[PDB]
Amino acid sequence: TXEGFPXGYX
Amino acid sequence: TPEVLGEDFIRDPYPVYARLRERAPVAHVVLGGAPMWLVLRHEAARAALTDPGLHKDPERCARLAARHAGVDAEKSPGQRMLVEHMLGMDPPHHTRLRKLVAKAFTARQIQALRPRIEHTVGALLDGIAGQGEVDLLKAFAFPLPLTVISEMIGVPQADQAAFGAWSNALTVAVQPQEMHGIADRMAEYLTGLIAAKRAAPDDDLISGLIQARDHEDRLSENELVSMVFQLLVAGYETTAHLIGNGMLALLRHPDQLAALRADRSLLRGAVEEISRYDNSLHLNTLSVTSEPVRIGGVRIPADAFVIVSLGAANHDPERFEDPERFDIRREAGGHLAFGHGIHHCMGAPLARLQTEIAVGALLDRFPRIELAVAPAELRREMNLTRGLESLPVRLG
Ligand code: HEM
């Protein structure tokens, strides 16, 4: 998520 | 051939690490249908984490990802908030951001951290004392960092549960428009909070971030939203699952639990070993190459995804002896649970502080704490962050 993708991890 | 890494890997990664890390210091794998390079050995991981060939470029990652899915405009404030933080950029831009964010911490903010953590821990344990069984995650491990970080940042008490729930929902979103929707709400909320601290500065980190300057340089409105978001979420579920995994390790090793209760001089070493043994993050954030790079003797081409397994490195027998054993008396110094290099975790002292206090206070208040379920009943979340679905404990 915190590099801009769904799938958790930010 | 590229080994496919699926749900079994997500739930139980360290046996995969043990087999790939022996074969080579870096593995070519497929994770979520995306081919990528997994750095496994400790030396290789330190080198990758200090290698300027690995770039934090969410825009290039997006473009590369579209190609693997065979699919090919205005970004919403949620979209921007997700990627315009420290972990989304390289120097010089990264250097500037982190220079300004470090200025925002005042000495008063830092000193209030420990008293505030012990007060929140206290309140939380008062609220569960008397219950025979509790889920330690929902009753303690998640609320504690939510409160501590929220109070440091300046999120009002009445809004903290809602921000936590939005973070969980961001964490489980499966579709970009859904994720972007959640994020858009979060960014809208953080925009209001920021506006109120511009108007009335308080003694919180939002106000510090607004005021930080490097001559006339300052964090823009965009950078403020993205950094307040990252600071709120980067230590929420990561700290909670550190506490969760560590308490799980301690409960599965009752002699070391008892030893720790009797001798608090082992606490610092116990937190270090928890980070080494079962860190909430066994993988770092995705990086992308622009040119070929050399990591552990393995050539990685340009336009490749590269991920560094902190967990595999922390379980590397070349660096730590008997690495699959949990042992609080070990020399666990030098683990990579908080990263390494320019992106080394800014919150690492705060994460250590909360974990040390929380575990210490748990063993003081509940001398007869034990797992309330058989280990075969525990479940790991289907998530890149290593964490349990619940931690049922009998407080006794
Ligand atoms: C046990 C809890 C935590 C763990 C395991 C952890 C781990 C990490 C790791 C491994 C990185 C490097 C990421 C990479 O290279 O891809 C990182 C970065 C970062 N963390 Fe933490 N962290 C924790 C808690 C926190 C807390 C409590 C905060 C702040 C409240 C925080 C703020 C940050 C920030 C701002 C960065 C980015 C720094 C940069 O990119 O230069 N983290 N964290």
DSSP conformation letters of B201-223: --SSHHHHHHH--BTTB---HHH
E strand or H helix at B392: strand B392-394
Distance B309 CA to ligand 1 centre (A): 15
Query: Closest Cα to residue A5, out of B65, B391, B105?
Result: B65
Interior CA angle at B61 toward B290 and B220, to 5°?
A: 100
Q: Give the 3-state secondary structure of residue B12.
A: coil
How far is it between the farthest Cα atoms of chain A?
11
Query: Closest Cα to residue B154, out of B106, B222, B121?
Result: B106
Tokens 């929220």, residue located: B150
Do residue A3 and residue B178 have CB atoms under 8 angstroms apart? no
Radius of gyration of chain A (CA): 5
How far is it between the farthest Cα atoms of chain B?
62
Q: Long-range contact list for B8-16, CB < 8 A, 24+ apart? A: B10/B380, B10/B382, B10/B383, B10/B384, B11/B380, B11/B382, B12/B380, B13/B282, B13/B309, B13/B311, B13/B312, B13/B386, B14/B282, B14/B311, B14/B312, B14/B315, B14/B324
CA nearest to B176 within chain A: A6
Do residue A8 and residue B286 have CB atoms under 8 angstroms apart? no
Tokens describing residue B290: 């622009």
Q: Give the 3-state secondary structure of residue B66.
A: helix
Residue B134 near residue B143, CB atoms below 8 Å? no
Q: Find out if CATH 2.60.40.10 is the number for domain B3-72+77-394.
A: no
Cβ-proximal residues to B355 (8 Å cutoff; 6+ apart), any chain: B239, B242, B243, B246, B271, B274
Tokens describing residue A1: 């998520």
Å resolution of this model? 2.2
Cis before B2? omega within 30: no
Name the CA dihedral angle for B346, B349, B351, B357, rounded to a multiple of 10 degrees.
-170
Residue B311 near residue B282, CB atoms below 8 Å? yes
- Chain A residues inside the 8 Å CB shell of B385: 8-9
B240 lines ligand 1 (CB under 6 A): no
Nearest CA to ligand 1 atom 35: B346
Cβ-proximal residues to B345 (8 Å cutoff; 6+ apart), any chain: B234, B338, B339, B351
The technique is: X-ray
Q: What is d(CA B207, CA B221) in angstroms, rounded to the nearest whole number?
A: 13
Distance B235 CA to ligand 1 centre (A): 7
Tokens 């139980």, residue located: B12
Tokens describing residue B344: 């080394």
Nearest CA to ligand 1 atom 39: B343
Tokens describing residue B191: 């925009």
Q: Give the 3-state secondary structure of residue B315.
A: coil
Given the DSSP bridges, would you call strands B54-55 and B293-295 parallel, antiparallel or unpaired? unpaired
Burial class (CB in 10 A: 0-12, 13-18, 19+), B23: exposed
Nearest CB neighbour to A3, from listed B88, B171, B172: B88
Burial class (CB in 10 A: 0-12, 13-18, 19+), B337: buried
Residue B46 near residue B26, CB atoms below 8 Å? no
Radius of gyration of chain B (CA): 21
Name the CA dihedral angle for B132, B135, B136, B137, rounded to a multiple of 10 degrees.
-170
Q: Give the 3-state secondary structure of residue B130.
A: coil
